[PDB]
C-alpha cells in the first residue's frame, strides 16, 4: 500500500517504458486526456516518438541515452499537437523507466528552469541568509529555516519536526500567517510516523499531495512477463488511506513535506526530522520549487551537523576549567582552603548550596538546608551506607529518607562525598520545572484508523531536579582524593530513575603535572605523566629538566628542534618572574616514537616566607580543534588591543562634564525658585539621568540578542512625553513644524509602572526622524490612549513620508542598516523586549507611527 | 691556524686536566699566583688539595656530568683563602679545560651558578623583541641593538652584517653621546679571514679585555704527545695583526656575538655579527655574557621570520599578476589594454608604458618622444631579429646610438613584439646608486693592517634597477595571449649578466582556467588546468561540470564529501548574481590520490548584449601559509567593522539627550534668573558646551598627531577657572578637599585671546586627578600669573605624598599601555605643547606641584 498500488494522483500522467525497446508498457488511465486529446493510441507497444515533436522526442531520446538522468530532470516538452508543454521528470528502477508528465501552466516560471542548477538557482537568498546568520544558536536556526520555507512554498503553517531518541516527535518551531491555533511544543507518539514512511523518507526527499478527495487514477500493467513494477519513487503516488483520514481529520488537504536528513556520526545517515507544511485548501507548486527545497534541506542539515560540533566543543572547554581548577585547590592546604579562598567547591560543579561537615563543624554556604538537617542526612548516611564513600540521588524523595518530605523545595538534589569516617562534603541544587503539552495519545514503548487526538495534554514532573552528569562526578572524585593524599576501592553508587543499586565506578580527572628546582633539577613527576610520556618517576628525578630530560639530542623526550628549547627555556623564566599561569604551545616526542602536541600552563611555586622555590607546571591535552582555535583566535586579537582604551578614554572624558553639569544643576536646583523653571530642572535632570544610564551600557549585542535588563519602577506619562517632546522642540522650531499633543487629561496624568528612561529615549527618536521627514510648515499629531496596562501611541506627521528602503531597514528585512537604521532596529528590538511593535501606515499626505508598549498600572 | 697558539689573557687562570685520573697537566703561570697565594702547582697535582672540601665538591660531579655545559659557571673558594672564583669547564680531546675567574664584588653573592639562572638576565629584552610587530628587519635590528647596548654598557654596539661577496655593511648603530657614527660604511671581505668566520660557528661569543697587556704561558706538560689545543677556552689571546687592527680603531675592550640563522638546503649560515666596542679596558662577568648569547639565539630565530615574510609578498605579487592577466584575457583587442582602467603600466613595476600599433602611438608616462620611440623601434628590429624579446637596465650600455640625449628620463626598457612591427615598450627611469664604502676598496700571512679607514665613495654609471625573473614571465604571458587573439621558441634577450647579450628562455605565468555555457556543460578547459588534474580537454568537454566532471562519485575529479559538492554549486550559482571574483576554498582529488588545495575565483561571462552565457572560473595555487594569513585577515577586518558600528551606536543616543539639556537649558533662559543663578547659567553652559565639543570629535589621531584645529575665541581666565573647577568640586567634598585661589584680580578681569575648550578641558582632568590624589583633608592651591603675547603660568599645589614616578613618565611618552590617567595626563601634555608649554612635576615633603606654561595674545 506504501510501497506499491497502482493508483496515483490525478494532477499528472504517468508512462513506464522497458529498458531497451523503448516502448510504453505501462500508461496511466487519464494519460490519454492529458496528453493525445487535442493519432496513435497509448497502449501497450505504442512508442514514445509519436505523441512528442521532433525536438522533444530527441531531448527525450538524449536524456534516456544519459547515464545520471538525476541532474537534467525536469525535461520541459512539447506535445505533438499544439503547444501543452509538459514536465518530464524520469526516473529508473529495475527493468524500468518511469516518465511523470505535469502540465507547465504559463503564468509561473515557463522555461525559467530545465534542469538542476537552474532548480537550485531558485533558493538562493534562502541560502544566502542562512549563511549569513551567526553560529552558536540552534533555535535560530530553526526559525529562520522554517520561516525561509514558508515564504518561499507559499504555503501556511509550516512547522519543523524533530526525532527524539524514542522516535517520539516533537514539534520544534512553527510559522502561520492568520491567527489560527499554534502547534508548538507539543509533543507526538513514536507511532503517528510508522517506521515504513521512516525508512521511506531515505529516499524520496520531497513528498507532495495535492487534493485529499481528488479521484485516484488506475495504472494497468501488461499480462506478459514483468510483473513486477513499483511506484515508490515516481512523484505521482496515492497516498495511504490511513494517512489520508489522519490528513482529513488535521483539517487540512494538501502536504508538502521534507526530510532532513544529517549525515553524521560513524554514511551513517540519520533522520533528523522534517519540515511540514500543510494547507487547508488545494495547492500546486512546479517541480522547480520542490527540487529548490530539497536543496535548501540539505544547508539545512549541513548547517546543523556543523552546530552540533560547536556544541560539544563546550563540554570539553569545562573540562579543562575544571582541571585548570582542580589543580588550583591542589595548590593549597588544608580542607579550609577549598572554601576559603575565592573560587570555591561551589565552583566546581554547577549546583545551588555547598556544606562541608569537618570535626563536628559545619561550613555552609549557599541554599542549603538547616545544621540538625544535615546532622540527621549524615547520621542516615552512615547507618545505611557502608558500602560506598558517595551517591548522586537526584531526587531525595524518591530515595529513602524519612525527612525529605520536611527538608523542602530548594534541596533533594543531592551529590555526597566521605572524606574520612565522619568528615564528608555535599552538594545541593533546587528544583527544576518541567512539563509536556502531549499531542494526543502517549506512545508508551495496523489498520488502527484516525483517532483526532490533536486536543490536549497535561505532564509535569516534580523536585528530580537536573541530573547529575559524569564529569561532575569524577571532578567529586578527583577532590575526594586530593583532599584524601593531603589529610596523610572508591566505589560509590548513583539513584538516577529511582533504581536502587547502580554502581559504577568513576575514574581520576587529574592533569598530567610535573614540577622543578629553582636551579633546573626534576622533582615532582605525578603517575598521569608517566603514563602520557612512557617514563618513569624513578628515571626521570635530579635531573635538569631543560637540556636532560627535554632535549634535542641524547634526552628522554625529545624536542622538534631547538626553536622548541630556547621557547622552554623562556617560557620557565618568564613564569618564575610573571605572575599567573601562561598557556604556551608544547609538542614534544615520547620514549616509543609517538608526537604528543599540547597546552603547557606554568607557575611559580610559594613556601611559607615569600621566596620562590621552584616551578609548578601542568598540560592540557586539548582537542586539535579546539587547538586550531584558540591558536587562530590568539593570532587574530593581537591586532585589536585600541578599541577598549579608545572606548574607556572617551567614556571618562564623557563622564567628567557629565558630572560637571550634574554640578551645576546642583546649585540651580538647590536655590528656590517660582514653578515653571523648577519643572523645566526636572525635565533636565530627567533626561540628564537618561544620558548617564546610556553611558553605563557597553554592548550593542545585548540589546540586539534582546536580553538586556530591565529596571521596573513608577512614572507617569505626562512627564515623559513631555521630556520627549522637548528633546526634539529645538529640531521642531528649526523647520518651523508644529508638534501637537492629542492626549487626553486622563491618559496624560496616568500613574504607570514600568522603564520609563527607554520609553523616552524609544518615543524621542521616533518624534526625532518624525520631525526630520515632515517638510516645512508641516503638522505632527502625537497622541497616547491607554487599555495589565495596553499604551497606544499615534505619530502622525504629515508629509510624503519616509522613504520604504528606510521601512525595510527597520523591519530588519534590510542587511544594509544605516546609522539611522541603527537606531530604528535598537528601537525595534527594545519594543518587542517591551511586549509590542512598531508599525508604519501611508496615506495621503501623512505618515503615521503606530507604537503598542505593555506597562503595569 | 690559531690552535697552535700558547698564549692566555691575564684576568684569569686556566688548568688543564687529564681525561682519566684527573690530574694536573697544564697549569698558566698567572695559576700560581692567582689561586694559592693568600702546596706548588706542578704536574699531576691533586686538584682536590686546590680549594675547600664543600667547594671541592661541585667540581667532581661537574665532570662526572654528561653534557657539562648545562652547568658551567661555578662558584668555587680556594682551600685556605676562600676567594671566589667562576669555574668554566669543557672538554678537548683526552682533556678538560678548566677556566677561573675572579668574581668582582659588584654582586659577590647570589647571581647566577648554571645556564639557566644566568639566561634570566635577559628577559627584559626577549620581552621587548617579542613584542615588537613583524614586517620590517630595521625596527628589529635596531632594537637588538638598543638592547644590547643597555645590557652590556660598552661604548659602541654595530651589527655588521655580510652580504653574499662576504664583504660587511654596517646596517644599524647606536653609540654613546659624541664618538664617530659608522652606519652606512661597506668593508672588504678580507677584514674577517675565513678562519674566524669557521671558529666563530663553534665559539659564539669573543671577549677581548686587554689589547695591550702582560700575557702567560701555558707551560705544557712535556710527557704529553699531543698539543694541548686552546681555541674553545675563553682567556685564549687574540692575534698580534688584529691587536694593532683595534689599535687602529681606537678602541681596546671588545665583546662580540656571532648570529647563526638556519637556512633551508638545514644548514648553518653566519648571518653577521654585534660587535660592542670600548675605549678603555672593560670586564663582564659570565653570567651576562651567557644570556647576550641567549639574546642572540632569540634575535636569530626572529631574524628568519621576516624573511619567509619577504616569500609571501612574492607569491602574492604572482598571484595578482595572475589575476591582472585573467582580466585582460577577456578583452575587446588592443586599445583597451591601454584605455581601460587596469592598464599595461599596472603589469610590471615601471615609471612608463608605451604601445606602437599599425604605425600609431599609444603613451600612458613618462616616455621619450614619438619620434625616439620610432628610432627605439628602428635600430631595435635592425640589430634583434633572433629575439621576440629583449630587457636592457642601460640603454647606453645596450648599444643604442641615441641613448645619450634621453638623459635622465629613462634608462632602462623592456620591449616585446607582438607583430612584425607591432610592439609594447616599459620604460623604466634612471636611479642613483651611492655607497658610502668606507675604509678601502674590496676586490675579489705577515700583513698588517691599514691605518687609515677613510670614507671614500663609490658611484655606478647610468643605471635603473633591473627587471626581475617572474616580471619578464608576466611580459611573455601577455605576449602569448595577445598573439593568440591576434588570429581570430622565443629566446627572450636580457642584457643584464655585463657579458654582452645572454639568451634566456622564460615560462608563461597563466593560471588554470575553465569555463561553462549557462546551462552546465563544459565549454572551456585549458592545458594548464589539464597538466594540473591530468585530464584531457577532449575527455572532459560537453559534460555537466557539477555531477559528472566534480563529483562524489564516478566522476573525472572526485570531491571529498557531500558539502563539496554543496558549496560549488552555492558559489557556481551566485557568481552569476553577484558578478564579483569572489575567492572561495576548494579541494578535489586527481586522478590519481592528489588532494590538490586551492581557490577558486569565478566571474559571470556577460557579453555586449547584456545576456549571461555561462561562467568563467579559474583557480589560484596558494601556499597553506599564504591561505591562512588571508583567513586570518579576513576574520580581523568581520571585528574591525563590528567594533566600529558598536562605536558609531553611542553617539546618537548621547546626542539626543544632550539636545534636551541643551533646549531645557534655552526655556531656563526663558524664564527668571537671580543674580548668582545666571553665573551658574553661564558655567552650566561652559561645561555642556565642552561635553558637546568632545562628543562631537570623531578621531582621537587627529589630536594625536597635531591636526586638530583649534576654535579660536575670546574669554577670560576667571570663567575657564569657574567652569573647570565646577566640573570637580563633588569628588573634593568627596574627599573632603579644600580648593583654594591666590590669582590676582586683573589677571581675571584680563581679556584672553584662544581657546577656552582645551583650557578648561585640560584645567578640569588636571584638578580632578590632583583631588583624586590628595588625602583627606588636605588642600589644593591654584596660582596663576599672567605677564605682558601674554604668557600665563599656571601653578596647582595639593598636599599628600605625590603621583607615581610612573605616571609622570607616562605623560611623558615612554609607555606601551599609558592607562587612563597616563593617557590623559599625554593628551593634557600635548595640548599644552600645541600652546608651546609643558606639564612639569615637582614633589616636596607633603606636596606635590603641577607647573602649566603657556602663551596667549592679548589687547
Ligand atoms: C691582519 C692579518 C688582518 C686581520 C686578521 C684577523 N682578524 C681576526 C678577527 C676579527 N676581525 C674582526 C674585525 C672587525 N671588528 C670590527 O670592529 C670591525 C669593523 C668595525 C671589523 C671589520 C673581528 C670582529 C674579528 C673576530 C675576533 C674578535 O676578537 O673580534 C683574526 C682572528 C683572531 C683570533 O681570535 O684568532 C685575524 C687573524 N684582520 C684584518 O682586518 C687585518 C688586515
Ligand atoms: C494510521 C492509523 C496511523 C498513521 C499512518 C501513516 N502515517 C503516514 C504518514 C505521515 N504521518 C505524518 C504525521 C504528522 N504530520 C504532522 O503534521 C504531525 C504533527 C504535527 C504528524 C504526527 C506525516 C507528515 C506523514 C508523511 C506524509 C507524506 O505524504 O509522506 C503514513 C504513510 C503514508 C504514505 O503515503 O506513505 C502512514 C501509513 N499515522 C498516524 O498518525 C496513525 C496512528
Redesign the interface.
Known sequence: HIQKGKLIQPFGCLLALDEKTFKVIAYSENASELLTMAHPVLGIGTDIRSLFTAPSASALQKALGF??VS??NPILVHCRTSAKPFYAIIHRVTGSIIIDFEPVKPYEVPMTA?????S??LA?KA??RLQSLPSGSMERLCDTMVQEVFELTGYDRVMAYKFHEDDHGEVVSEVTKPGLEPYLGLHYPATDIPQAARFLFMKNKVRMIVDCNAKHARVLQDEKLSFDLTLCGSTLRAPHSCHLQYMANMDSIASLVMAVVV?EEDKRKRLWGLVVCHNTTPRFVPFPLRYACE?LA??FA?HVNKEVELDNQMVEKNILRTQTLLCDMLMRDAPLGIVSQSPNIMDLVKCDGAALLYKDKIWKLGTTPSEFHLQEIASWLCEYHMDSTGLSTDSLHDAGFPRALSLGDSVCGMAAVRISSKDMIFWFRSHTAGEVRWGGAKHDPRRMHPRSSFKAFLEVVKTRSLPWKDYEMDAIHSLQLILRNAFKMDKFTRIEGDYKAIIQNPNPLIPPIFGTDE??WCTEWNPAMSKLTGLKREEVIDK?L???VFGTQ?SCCRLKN??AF?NL??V???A??SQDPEKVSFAFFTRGGKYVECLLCVSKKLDREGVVTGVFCFLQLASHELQQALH?QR??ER??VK?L?????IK???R??????????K??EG?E??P??RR??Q??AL??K??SK??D?S???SIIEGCLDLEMKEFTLNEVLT?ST??????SNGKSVRITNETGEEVMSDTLYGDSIRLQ?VL??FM?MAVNFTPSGGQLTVSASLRLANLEIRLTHTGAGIPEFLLNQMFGTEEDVS?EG??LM?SRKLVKLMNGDVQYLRQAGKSSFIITAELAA
Do not use: H
Not at 522637548?726 to 529640531?731: L, W
Open positions: 547515464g545520471d541532474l537534467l530545465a534542469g538542476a542548477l537552474q537550485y538557482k538562493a541560502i544566502t549525515n536543496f540539505q544547508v549541513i636551579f633546573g635538569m631543560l637540556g636532560e641524547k631547538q626553536e630556547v627555556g623562556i620557565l623564566n618568564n618564575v618572574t587562530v593570532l587574530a591586532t585589536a578599541r582604551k579608545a572606548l574607556a578614554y571618562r572624558q564623557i567628567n562634564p557629565l558630572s560637571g553639569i550634574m554640578f551645576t544643576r546649585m540651580i536655590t525658585l517660582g515653571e523653571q523645566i530642572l525635565t533636565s533626561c540628564q537618561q544620558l546610556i553611558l551600557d554592548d550593542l549585542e521630556a522637548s528633546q526634539v522642540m529645538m529640531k529615549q524621542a527618536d526625532l546609522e541603527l537606531s535598537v
